[PDB]
Amino acid sequence: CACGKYKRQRFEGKVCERCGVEVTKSIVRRYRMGHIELATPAAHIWFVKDVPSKIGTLLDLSATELEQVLYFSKYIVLDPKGAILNGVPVEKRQLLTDEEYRELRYGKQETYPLPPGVDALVKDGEEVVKGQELAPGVVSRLDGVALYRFPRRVRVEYVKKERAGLRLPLAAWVEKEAYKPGEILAELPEPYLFGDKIVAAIDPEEEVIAEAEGVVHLHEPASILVVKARVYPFEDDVEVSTGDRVAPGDVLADGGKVKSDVYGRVEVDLVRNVVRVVESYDIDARMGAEAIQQLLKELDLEALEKELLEEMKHPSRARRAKARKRLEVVRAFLDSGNRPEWMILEAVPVLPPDLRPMVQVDGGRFATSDLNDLYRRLINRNNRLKKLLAQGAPEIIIRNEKRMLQEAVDALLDNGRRGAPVTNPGSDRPLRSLTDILSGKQGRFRQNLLGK
Amino acid sequence: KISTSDPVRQYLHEIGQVPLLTLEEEVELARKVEEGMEAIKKLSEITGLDPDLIREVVRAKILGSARVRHIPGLKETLDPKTVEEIDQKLKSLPKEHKRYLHIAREGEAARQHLIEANLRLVVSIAKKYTGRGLSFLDLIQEGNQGLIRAVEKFEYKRRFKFSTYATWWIRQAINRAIADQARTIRIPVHMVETINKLSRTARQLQQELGREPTYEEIAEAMGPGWDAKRVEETLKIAQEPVSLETPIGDEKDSFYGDFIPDEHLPSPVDAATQSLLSEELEKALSKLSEREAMVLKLRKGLIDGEEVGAFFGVTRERIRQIENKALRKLKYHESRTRKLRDFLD
Ligand SMILES: [Zn+2]
């Protein structure tokens, strides 16, 4: 054994109490398998990049390009349902781009145009920005022409000292008059003798005024959010209370994800009772093996078998021919053998150890089966992934990694089908991929017949 | 197609659409990130729920549905019911504490938002720790993990901006990664710098001798406790391994890993050995006393290599007595019928 509690043959089939070792020599060390548990699946390149994409064929996707498109990068395929339009209904199996995708889920249009100086555009925008529904093409009037060409409501941001009126609680504490006592009314200087209304024009910064210390004198944004702003929603209990109550109760989720009616996102501004409700809805958008794993499970091959049967003998030769090639794969799958959800990878079998040695050479040199550098590739990535999810997760970085990850999962399986991995500067050599082991220049089945 | 370009384009495009303004936007987000903390904690205070739980539930509602909880972290938090229960108590929080809830989420968002904006910063940094032995994307990714680290500790109260702060927290993450993953046989950070200093020194030594320094110079130039045995050792660990699979001789079709022999495995000669040895050792063990013979047979051939602790109840005098008298009768009759003499080894 490893520690030596049991050391001969009498007890040959038992394992050690404190450490696990059942024995017959290290041949076990060369025939046993270990597995790596993948964060977010990836797929076998053996099944995705053979001429007939066995998954492209079975899953009616662009047999060769739709795959490559969603697989390695972020081109999403709406999996189950996505009510909101592009101009046409939800595309059951069609794919879209980041851009348009972006436009969807958050809210139709994003327009942040922030003014150049402190008094020209800051005023045009402010006057028409807070409660006024700004129609498309709202021609803001000062630097050049601030053009707001899209939908519903508007939210501006910071302001200097041209004149302070109707703004949020930021400045309230600055001039102690209104936040300390009820003096905002006398704040209007001299005509009151003959909601926010401040002095004629006394403050010029985005600060806190204990002593003018916590500040930030800068620019003022006027970002038009194309979303519908509700101020006084009411209570109707048919379905679970939607949106909000007058002022007390707020049943809506906070300001990220909340589906009320056909409109599905809800931001919250406790300034005025304002429940910002954006319009897009539950749009299942996925990219990568994740997306295909789903698609693959959902299919009842029997149905597609019978569907292709009809497609096969009835329409003309163009679409029926494609259907015969697509019925081939589906047939065997159902015929005898195993079912098709397995083509996707989430559990990576690891080749035995003694078969990917680590050995002492001359001088004290060492030598290991190239396979091991590839393995580390995957394990490192897979781990960095887990930790990247846990730490917190900014989208770009998670996919970025998922990509690498995928690539890696190819590497051990088969190298070169998509790019060729290299040991560091020394030999621009393809690290023998498990594939290269089987076939290869001088591979396995190959030299299995060259001689022993 | 080709992976570098796509990611570069990917984040550069988003920075291109959202860089963070120098002061305003980083200030803004920062403020929100901190308030989230203060919020979450006060939330743990009133709910009796661990800040870890309050943190994960707000994450789910702002970053992802049941999907992101189920696949990433296996299953301890019920995908629907569990998280929801938690959100309900958050709602129940009247006007006063409800405020922290709404803040926590918005803060969580800001966070994730700032993280996005400062990704060009990472890549710019990561760009220079290139030829260290890590993949540019691996490098950026670790550096990225570093920026996330900085986000947890930055105190906006202390005026300095996130730029200079991220630099450190990123450079730290990168260099570690470089030291931890670069080699196939892991080498501690100290050995790493050690190797850098060793290399650098060999460089200044190459400068004038015209003689690639004998391990004498390196010792000297390096410092206090450096000797020939030390340097010969470090440079031996510095050489990365070789590809067990490598083109050898005339690269026509030669693969290096077939030439190494095997040691544990009993080449036939040894299997035959154990057969006769054990059969003859077994014959002698029986025609004797199963006393001091098995003691020394089992103590030596069964477990580990203790005269006194060798025999059961009978002391040392009977041990040496039968050990040496049986061992010699055994040897001297084995001298007669010579079977063992021809040293099986
Ligand atoms: Zn043991």
mmCIF file of C-alpha atoms in Angstrom, chain A residues 149-416:
data_model
loop_
_atom_site.group_PDB
_atom_site.id
_atom_site.type_symbol
_atom_site.label_atom_id
_atom_site.label_comp_id
_atom_site.label_asym_id
_atom_site.label_seq_id
_atom_site.Cartn_x
_atom_site.Cartn_y
_atom_site.Cartn_z
ATOM 1 C CA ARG A 149 -34.771 60.357 -31.638
ATOM 2 C CA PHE A 150 -36.415 57.553 -29.640
ATOM 3 C CA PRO A 151 -39.705 56.518 -27.519
ATOM 4 C CA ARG A 152 -41.202 57.138 -23.984
ATOM 5 C CA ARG A 153 -39.585 58.936 -20.945
ATOM 6 C CA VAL A 154 -36.358 60.743 -19.874
ATOM 7 C CA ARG A 155 -33.947 60.847 -16.918
ATOM 8 C CA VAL A 156 -31.260 63.576 -16.686
ATOM 9 C CA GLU A 157 -28.397 63.529 -14.150
ATOM 10 C CA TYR A 158 -26.206 66.396 -12.777
ATOM 11 C CA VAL A 159 -26.601 70.265 -12.796
ATOM 12 C CA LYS A 160 -24.296 73.334 -11.856
ATOM 13 C CA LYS A 161 -25.455 76.777 -10.663
ATOM 14 C CA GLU A 162 -27.346 78.438 -13.525
ATOM 15 C CA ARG A 163 -30.488 78.133 -11.339
ATOM 16 C CA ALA A 164 -31.566 75.191 -9.148
ATOM 17 C CA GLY A 165 -35.149 73.965 -9.423
ATOM 18 C CA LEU A 166 -37.040 70.673 -9.192
ATOM 19 C CA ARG A 167 -33.944 68.481 -8.688
ATOM 20 C CA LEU A 168 -33.425 65.489 -6.327
ATOM 21 C CA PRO A 169 -32.262 65.603 -2.668
ATOM 22 C CA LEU A 170 -28.524 65.964 -3.465
ATOM 23 C CA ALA A 171 -28.289 69.775 -3.004
ATOM 24 C CA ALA A 172 -30.993 69.783 -0.251
ATOM 25 C CA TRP A 173 -28.410 69.314 2.517
ATOM 26 C CA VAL A 174 -25.936 71.747 0.858
ATOM 27 C CA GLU A 175 -27.984 74.928 1.462
ATOM 28 C CA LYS A 176 -29.200 73.945 4.929
ATOM 29 C CA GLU A 177 -32.307 76.210 4.573
ATOM 30 C CA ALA A 178 -34.686 73.470 3.220
ATOM 31 C CA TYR A 179 -33.253 70.245 4.766
ATOM 32 C CA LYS A 180 -32.694 71.831 8.235
ATOM 33 C CA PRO A 181 -35.980 73.817 8.458
ATOM 34 C CA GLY A 182 -38.842 74.615 6.039
ATOM 35 C CA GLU A 183 -37.035 77.503 4.270
ATOM 36 C CA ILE A 184 -36.999 76.452 0.547
ATOM 37 C CA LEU A 185 -39.956 78.855 -0.008
ATOM 38 C CA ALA A 186 -38.104 81.920 1.298
ATOM 39 C CA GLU A 187 -35.098 80.597 -0.742
ATOM 40 C CA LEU A 188 -36.800 82.343 -3.647
ATOM 41 C CA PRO A 189 -35.188 85.684 -2.788
ATOM 42 C CA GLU A 190 -37.013 89.031 -3.116
ATOM 43 C CA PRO A 191 -40.380 88.649 -5.032
ATOM 44 C CA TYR A 192 -42.172 86.345 -2.513
ATOM 45 C CA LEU A 193 -43.023 89.511 -0.553
ATOM 46 C CA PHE A 194 -44.778 91.337 -3.431
ATOM 47 C CA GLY A 195 -40.874 70.116 -5.304
ATOM 48 C CA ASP A 196 -37.675 72.174 -5.476
ATOM 49 C CA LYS A 197 -36.946 75.865 -5.973
ATOM 50 C CA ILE A 198 -33.565 77.159 -4.916
ATOM 51 C CA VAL A 199 -31.846 80.550 -4.822
ATOM 52 C CA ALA A 200 -31.185 82.625 -7.956
ATOM 53 C CA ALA A 201 -27.893 80.704 -8.574
ATOM 54 C CA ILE A 202 -25.459 80.042 -5.708
ATOM 55 C CA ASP A 203 -24.006 76.480 -5.974
ATOM 56 C CA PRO A 204 -21.799 75.064 -8.804
ATOM 57 C CA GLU A 205 -20.678 71.467 -7.799
ATOM 58 C CA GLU A 206 -21.717 67.766 -7.323
ATOM 59 C CA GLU A 207 -20.741 67.905 -3.670
ATOM 60 C CA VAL A 208 -21.638 67.520 -0.009
ATOM 61 C CA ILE A 209 -21.297 70.791 1.935
ATOM 62 C CA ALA A 210 -20.101 70.042 5.541
ATOM 63 C CA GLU A 211 -17.193 72.142 4.438
ATOM 64 C CA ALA A 212 -17.045 71.956 0.626
ATOM 65 C CA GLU A 213 -15.041 68.645 0.943
ATOM 66 C CA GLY A 214 -16.834 65.627 -0.645
ATOM 67 C CA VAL A 215 -17.159 67.102 -4.206
ATOM 68 C CA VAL A 216 -16.892 66.485 -7.940
ATOM 69 C CA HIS A 217 -17.436 69.568 -10.149
ATOM 70 C CA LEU A 218 -17.964 68.241 -13.661
ATOM 71 C CA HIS A 219 -20.319 67.424 -16.529
ATOM 72 C CA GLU A 220 -24.095 66.803 -16.666
ATOM 73 C CA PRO A 221 -25.620 63.794 -18.468
ATOM 74 C CA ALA A 222 -29.031 63.710 -20.169
ATOM 75 C CA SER A 223 -29.542 60.066 -20.938
ATOM 76 C CA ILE A 224 -32.880 59.238 -22.584
ATOM 77 C CA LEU A 225 -34.265 55.915 -21.434
ATOM 78 C CA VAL A 226 -36.954 54.777 -23.896
ATOM 79 C CA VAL A 227 -38.985 53.165 -21.035
ATOM 80 C CA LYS A 228 -42.523 53.920 -19.672
ATOM 81 C CA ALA A 229 -42.446 55.696 -16.281
ATOM 82 C CA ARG A 230 -45.338 55.133 -13.874
ATOM 83 C CA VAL A 231 -45.728 57.459 -10.872
ATOM 84 C CA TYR A 232 -48.966 56.439 -9.032
ATOM 85 C CA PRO A 233 -49.712 52.747 -9.824
ATOM 86 C CA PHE A 234 -52.759 51.161 -8.128
ATOM 87 C CA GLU A 235 -53.907 47.831 -6.638
ATOM 88 C CA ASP A 236 -55.944 45.252 -8.675
ATOM 89 C CA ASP A 237 -55.761 41.697 -7.198
ATOM 90 C CA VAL A 238 -56.884 39.480 -10.190
ATOM 91 C CA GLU A 239 -53.336 38.226 -10.849
ATOM 92 C CA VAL A 240 -50.721 38.828 -8.090
ATOM 93 C CA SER A 241 -50.596 42.620 -7.389
ATOM 94 C CA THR A 242 -48.683 44.112 -10.347
ATOM 95 C CA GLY A 243 -46.363 47.106 -10.178
ATOM 96 C CA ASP A 244 -47.032 49.242 -7.125
ATOM 97 C CA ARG A 245 -49.550 50.861 -4.780
ATOM 98 C CA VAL A 246 -49.995 54.622 -4.401
ATOM 99 C CA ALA A 247 -47.004 55.334 -2.112
ATOM 100 C CA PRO A 248 -46.982 52.776 0.808
ATOM 101 C CA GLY A 249 -46.743 49.258 -0.716
ATOM 102 C CA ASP A 250 -44.229 48.408 -3.458
ATOM 103 C CA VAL A 251 -44.673 44.777 -4.604
ATOM 104 C CA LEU A 252 -42.350 45.183 -7.622
ATOM 105 C CA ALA A 253 -38.855 43.732 -7.576
ATOM 106 C CA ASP A 254 -36.195 46.451 -6.969
ATOM 107 C CA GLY A 255 -34.629 47.643 -10.204
ATOM 108 C CA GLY A 256 -33.146 44.873 -12.129
ATOM 109 C CA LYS A 257 -35.450 42.036 -13.173
ATOM 110 C CA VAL A 258 -39.232 42.163 -12.638
ATOM 111 C CA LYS A 259 -41.981 40.913 -15.012
ATOM 112 C CA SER A 260 -45.428 42.571 -14.495
ATOM 113 C CA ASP A 261 -47.412 42.681 -17.768
ATOM 114 C CA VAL A 262 -46.160 42.172 -21.344
ATOM 115 C CA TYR A 263 -43.503 44.716 -20.344
ATOM 116 C CA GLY A 264 -40.868 42.911 -18.250
ATOM 117 C CA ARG A 265 -38.175 44.970 -16.515
ATOM 118 C CA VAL A 266 -38.585 47.202 -13.485
ATOM 119 C CA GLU A 267 -36.211 49.911 -12.282
ATOM 120 C CA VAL A 268 -36.969 51.884 -9.121
ATOM 121 C CA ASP A 269 -36.420 55.559 -8.296
ATOM 122 C CA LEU A 270 -37.582 56.254 -4.756
ATOM 123 C CA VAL A 271 -37.214 60.023 -5.487
ATOM 124 C CA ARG A 272 -40.769 60.572 -6.712
ATOM 125 C CA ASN A 273 -42.833 57.406 -6.518
ATOM 126 C CA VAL A 274 -41.575 56.340 -9.910
ATOM 127 C CA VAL A 275 -41.631 52.712 -10.884
ATOM 128 C CA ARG A 276 -39.644 52.550 -14.096
ATOM 129 C CA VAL A 277 -41.029 49.682 -16.130
ATOM 130 C CA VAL A 278 -39.137 48.678 -19.298
ATOM 131 C CA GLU A 279 -40.865 46.806 -22.146
ATOM 132 C CA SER A 280 -38.798 43.729 -23.351
ATOM 133 C CA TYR A 281 -39.627 40.249 -21.813
ATOM 134 C CA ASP A 282 -38.366 36.710 -20.962
ATOM 135 C CA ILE A 283 -36.123 36.110 -23.921
ATOM 136 C CA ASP A 284 -34.217 32.845 -23.478
ATOM 137 C CA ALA A 285 -30.900 33.711 -25.046
ATOM 138 C CA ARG A 286 -27.986 31.278 -24.902
ATOM 139 C CA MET A 287 -24.682 30.650 -26.717
ATOM 140 C CA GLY A 288 -22.283 27.747 -26.396
ATOM 141 C CA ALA A 289 -22.689 24.065 -25.621
ATOM 142 C CA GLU A 290 -25.217 25.163 -23.040
ATOM 143 C CA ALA A 291 -27.609 26.173 -25.794
ATOM 144 C CA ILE A 292 -27.139 22.929 -27.737
ATOM 145 C CA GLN A 293 -27.393 20.684 -24.772
ATOM 146 C CA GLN A 294 -30.898 22.042 -24.252
ATOM 147 C CA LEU A 295 -31.903 21.753 -27.907
ATOM 148 C CA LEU A 296 -30.543 18.218 -27.994
ATOM 149 C CA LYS A 297 -32.552 16.995 -24.954
ATOM 150 C CA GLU A 298 -35.849 18.499 -26.101
ATOM 151 C CA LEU A 299 -35.989 16.459 -29.354
ATOM 152 C CA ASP A 300 -38.204 13.426 -29.663
ATOM 153 C CA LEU A 301 -36.431 11.672 -32.534
ATOM 154 C CA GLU A 302 -39.589 9.617 -33.227
ATOM 155 C CA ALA A 303 -41.396 12.799 -34.296
ATOM 156 C CA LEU A 304 -38.544 14.009 -36.477
ATOM 157 C CA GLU A 305 -38.342 10.448 -37.886
ATOM 158 C CA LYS A 306 -41.982 10.440 -38.915
ATOM 159 C CA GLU A 307 -41.713 14.133 -40.006
ATOM 160 C CA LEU A 308 -38.789 13.353 -42.277
ATOM 161 C CA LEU A 309 -40.545 10.211 -43.535
ATOM 162 C CA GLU A 310 -43.204 12.456 -45.046
ATOM 163 C CA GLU A 311 -40.671 15.081 -46.146
ATOM 164 C CA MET A 312 -38.690 12.259 -47.754
ATOM 165 C CA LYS A 313 -41.213 10.739 -50.249
ATOM 166 C CA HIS A 314 -43.572 13.666 -50.872
ATOM 167 C CA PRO A 315 -41.910 17.051 -51.749
ATOM 168 C CA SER A 316 -39.511 17.500 -54.712
ATOM 169 C CA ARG A 317 -35.831 16.397 -54.618
ATOM 170 C CA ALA A 318 -34.230 19.522 -52.968
ATOM 171 C CA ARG A 319 -35.648 19.483 -49.422
ATOM 172 C CA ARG A 320 -36.481 15.748 -49.400
ATOM 173 C CA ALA A 321 -32.834 14.831 -50.205
ATOM 174 C CA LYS A 322 -31.596 16.887 -47.288
ATOM 175 C CA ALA A 323 -34.210 15.075 -45.168
ATOM 176 C CA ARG A 324 -32.939 11.631 -46.179
ATOM 177 C CA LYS A 325 -29.437 12.529 -44.996
ATOM 178 C CA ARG A 326 -30.891 13.922 -41.843
ATOM 179 C CA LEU A 327 -32.974 10.802 -41.270
ATOM 180 C CA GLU A 328 -29.906 8.585 -41.416
ATOM 181 C CA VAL A 329 -28.404 9.877 -38.170
ATOM 182 C CA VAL A 330 -31.782 9.934 -36.334
ATOM 183 C CA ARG A 331 -32.439 6.337 -37.326
ATOM 184 C CA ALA A 332 -29.392 4.657 -35.829
ATOM 185 C CA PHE A 333 -29.765 6.778 -32.667
ATOM 186 C CA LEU A 334 -33.158 5.245 -32.126
ATOM 187 C CA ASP A 335 -32.485 1.911 -33.857
ATOM 188 C CA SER A 336 -30.027 0.212 -31.470
ATOM 189 C CA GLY A 337 -27.205 1.646 -29.406
ATOM 190 C CA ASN A 338 -27.544 4.832 -27.379
ATOM 191 C CA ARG A 339 -29.491 8.053 -27.291
ATOM 192 C CA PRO A 340 -28.084 11.502 -28.621
ATOM 193 C CA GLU A 341 -28.032 13.730 -25.501
ATOM 194 C CA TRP A 342 -24.533 12.420 -24.787
ATOM 195 C CA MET A 343 -22.795 14.225 -27.688
ATOM 196 C CA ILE A 344 -22.502 17.192 -25.448
ATOM 197 C CA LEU A 345 -19.628 17.257 -22.926
ATOM 198 C CA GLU A 346 -19.840 18.159 -19.265
ATOM 199 C CA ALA A 347 -17.748 15.283 -17.828
ATOM 200 C CA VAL A 348 -14.279 14.846 -19.400
ATOM 201 C CA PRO A 349 -12.727 11.395 -19.039
ATOM 202 C CA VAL A 350 -9.059 11.576 -18.120
ATOM 203 C CA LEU A 351 -6.606 9.056 -19.456
ATOM 204 C CA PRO A 352 -4.719 6.893 -16.897
ATOM 205 C CA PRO A 353 -1.460 8.233 -15.309
ATOM 206 C CA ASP A 354 1.156 5.678 -16.123
ATOM 207 C CA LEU A 355 0.005 6.175 -19.739
ATOM 208 C CA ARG A 356 0.931 9.834 -19.525
ATOM 209 C CA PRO A 357 4.151 9.321 -17.472
ATOM 210 C CA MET A 358 6.320 11.756 -15.638
ATOM 211 C CA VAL A 359 9.835 10.241 -15.771
ATOM 212 C CA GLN A 360 13.404 10.782 -14.650
ATOM 213 C CA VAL A 361 15.888 10.857 -17.532
ATOM 214 C CA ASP A 362 19.599 11.731 -18.016
ATOM 215 C CA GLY A 363 21.369 14.198 -15.769
ATOM 216 C CA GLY A 364 18.102 14.386 -14.043
ATOM 217 C CA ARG A 365 15.986 15.319 -17.032
ATOM 218 C CA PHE A 366 12.339 14.468 -16.966
ATOM 219 C CA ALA A 367 9.827 13.384 -19.597
ATOM 220 C CA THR A 368 6.071 13.417 -19.756
ATOM 221 C CA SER A 369 3.368 12.535 -22.292
ATOM 222 C CA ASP A 370 2.367 15.743 -24.028
ATOM 223 C CA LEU A 371 -1.214 14.911 -23.019
ATOM 224 C CA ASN A 372 -0.445 16.279 -19.564
ATOM 225 C CA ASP A 373 0.230 19.823 -20.602
ATOM 226 C CA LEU A 374 -3.185 19.809 -22.319
ATOM 227 C CA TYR A 375 -4.828 18.349 -19.336
ATOM 228 C CA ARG A 376 -3.504 21.168 -17.139
ATOM 229 C CA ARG A 377 -4.855 23.572 -19.753
ATOM 230 C CA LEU A 378 -8.360 22.325 -19.190
ATOM 231 C CA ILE A 379 -8.145 21.876 -15.405
ATOM 232 C CA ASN A 380 -6.707 25.360 -14.927
ATOM 233 C CA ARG A 381 -9.328 26.944 -17.144
ATOM 234 C CA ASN A 382 -12.150 24.928 -15.621
ATOM 235 C CA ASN A 383 -11.038 26.026 -12.169
ATOM 236 C CA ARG A 384 -10.446 29.728 -13.089
ATOM 237 C CA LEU A 385 -14.008 29.464 -14.443
ATOM 238 C CA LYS A 386 -15.564 28.263 -11.186
ATOM 239 C CA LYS A 387 -13.728 30.939 -9.208
ATOM 240 C CA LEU A 388 -14.786 33.526 -11.830
ATOM 241 C CA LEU A 389 -18.419 32.638 -11.316
ATOM 242 C CA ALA A 390 -18.142 32.714 -7.589
ATOM 243 C CA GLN A 391 -16.133 35.917 -7.265
ATOM 244 C CA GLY A 392 -18.844 37.747 -9.179
ATOM 245 C CA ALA A 393 -19.400 37.648 -12.853
ATOM 246 C CA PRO A 394 -18.948 40.304 -15.509
ATOM 247 C CA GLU A 395 -20.316 38.798 -18.751
ATOM 248 C CA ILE A 396 -17.475 39.499 -21.205
ATOM 249 C CA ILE A 397 -14.958 37.785 -18.924
ATOM 250 C CA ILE A 398 -17.046 34.704 -18.251
ATOM 251 C CA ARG A 399 -17.644 34.021 -21.924
ATOM 252 C CA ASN A 400 -14.093 34.942 -22.739
ATOM 253 C CA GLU A 401 -13.037 32.115 -20.431
ATOM 254 C CA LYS A 402 -15.810 29.715 -21.525
ATOM 255 C CA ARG A 403 -14.310 30.135 -25.011
ATOM 256 C CA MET A 404 -10.830 29.189 -23.856
ATOM 257 C CA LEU A 405 -12.346 26.388 -21.914
ATOM 258 C CA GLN A 406 -14.089 25.054 -25.023
ATOM 259 C CA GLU A 407 -10.942 25.325 -27.083
ATOM 260 C CA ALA A 408 -9.136 23.433 -24.361
ATOM 261 C CA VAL A 409 -11.654 20.604 -24.379
ATOM 262 C CA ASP A 410 -10.861 20.262 -28.070
ATOM 263 C CA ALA A 411 -7.097 20.166 -27.471
ATOM 264 C CA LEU A 412 -6.924 16.903 -25.556
ATOM 265 C CA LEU A 413 -9.554 15.231 -27.753
ATOM 266 C CA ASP A 414 -8.164 16.451 -31.093
ATOM 267 C CA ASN A 415 -5.634 19.134 -31.811
ATOM 268 C CA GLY A 416 -5.434 21.047 -35.046
#
